[PDB]
Design a protein around this motif. Structure first.
Motif, short mmCIF file in Angstrom:
data_model
loop_
_atom_site.label_atom_id
_atom_site.label_comp_id
_atom_site.label_asym_id
_atom_site.label_seq_id
_atom_site.Cartn_x
_atom_site.Cartn_y
_atom_site.Cartn_z
N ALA A 1 -1.57 -2.65 -5.94
CA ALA A 1 -1.47 -3.43 -4.71
C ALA A 1 -1.24 -2.53 -3.50
O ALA A 1 -1.86 -2.72 -2.45
N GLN A 2 -0.35 -1.54 -3.63
CA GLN A 2 -0.09 -0.63 -2.52
C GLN A 2 -1.32 0.19 -2.17
O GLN A 2 -1.53 0.52 -1.00
N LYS A 3 -2.13 0.54 -3.17
CA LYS A 3 -3.36 1.27 -2.91
C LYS A 3 -4.34 0.44 -2.08
O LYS A 3 -5.00 0.96 -1.18
N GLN A 4 -4.45 -0.86 -2.39
CA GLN A 4 -5.31 -1.73 -1.59
C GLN A 4 -4.85 -1.78 -0.14
O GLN A 4 -5.66 -1.69 0.78
N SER A 5 -3.54 -1.93 0.07
CA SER A 5 -3.01 -1.99 1.43
C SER A 5 -3.14 -0.64 2.14
O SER A 5 -3.43 -0.59 3.34
N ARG A 6 -2.91 0.46 1.41
CA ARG A 6 -3.05 1.78 2.02
C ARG A 6 -4.49 2.04 2.42
O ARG A 6 -4.76 2.67 3.45
#
Length: 40
Positions: free
Chosen positions: A15-20
């Motif tokens: 999830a953090q990769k998508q937001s990043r």
RNA sequence: AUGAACUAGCCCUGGGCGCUUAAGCGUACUACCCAUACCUCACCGUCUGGGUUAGCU
């Protein structure tokens, strides 16, 4: 033999990769838009 | 050049100390004084509007 990197951590990192990815793309186009805006 | 009648202003007669080409009155222009007012900042409180959890060394 080794601890297997809990699955909640894996879900969060995905999830953090998508937001990043979104943040970089938004700032990548913002810098180009801001430079053109300043000239205007 | 004088005189008369008048035109007004002020005087005479009818906070303290002190001031009199004012430290009075009128006008104009600079400078200066300082309120709890105004501006900038800090701090207190209240109100209002947000942000904040796969709780990311």
């Amino acid at each position: 033999a080794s601890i297997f990197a809990p699955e909640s951590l894996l879900k969060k990192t995905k999830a953090q990769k998508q937001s990043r990815e979104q943040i970089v793309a938004a700032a990548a186009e913002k810098k180009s838009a801001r430079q053109k805006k300043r000239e205007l």
